[PDB]
């Protein structure tokens, strides 16, 4: 029959869900879900334009607002970016791997000051 590659057609809800599942914490903020789609789906990568973002981001927010499987967690303090995750009882648990991150460097060596060059 037809189709022999890819996932066929994953809905917005499925992609949002996969982003959350892909996270080690099983929860993601809206910005993280956006980044996951840009890196995971070439369609959303191509549509990553600033103006296109209007419909891009609104559709995710609409799907999240259905709340059938999506739940929302407050954050530890800087709660402007709430967490979005899957209902845990409304699913099964799993574990996503982790990897190394961060680095450290420095671009300074001396201070700059001058004065008292007189008697």
Swiss-Prot record:
Residue span of motif Nuclear localization signal: 98-100
Modification comment: Phosphorylation by NLK promotes nuclear export and inhibits the transcriptional activity. Ubiquitinated by SKP2. Ubiquitination leads to proteasomal degradation. Ubiquitinated by STUB1/CHIP; when Ser-103 is phosphorylated.
Mutagenesis / variant outcome for changing residue 95 to A: Disrupts DNA-binding
Impact upon substituting residue 103 to D: Reduces DNA binding, does not promote nuclear exclusion but reduces transactivation
Domain of life: Eukaryota
Region described as DNA-binding: spans on this chain: 58-65, 81-84
Disease link: Rhabdomyosarcoma 2: A form of rhabdomyosarcoma, a highly malignant tumor of striated muscle derived from primitive mesenchymal cells and exhibiting differentiation along rhabdomyoblastic lines. Rhabdomyosarcoma is one of the most frequently occurring soft tissue sarcomas and the most common in children. It occurs in four forms: alveolar, pleomorphic, embryonal and botryoidal rhabdomyosarcomas.
Biological role stated in the UniProt entry: Transcription factor that is the main target of insulin signaling and regulates metabolic homeostasis in response to oxidative stress. Binds to the insulin response element (IRE) with consensus sequence 5'-TT[G/A]TTTTG-3' and the related Daf-16 family binding element (DBE) with consensus sequence 5'-TT[G/A]TTTAC-3'. Activity suppressed by insulin. Main regulator of redox balance and osteoblast numbers and controls bone mass. Orchestrates the endocrine function of the skeleton in regulating glucose metabolism.
Protein's name in the database: Forkhead box protein O1
Organism: Homo sapiens (Human)
Residues of the full protein shown: 159 to 272 of 655
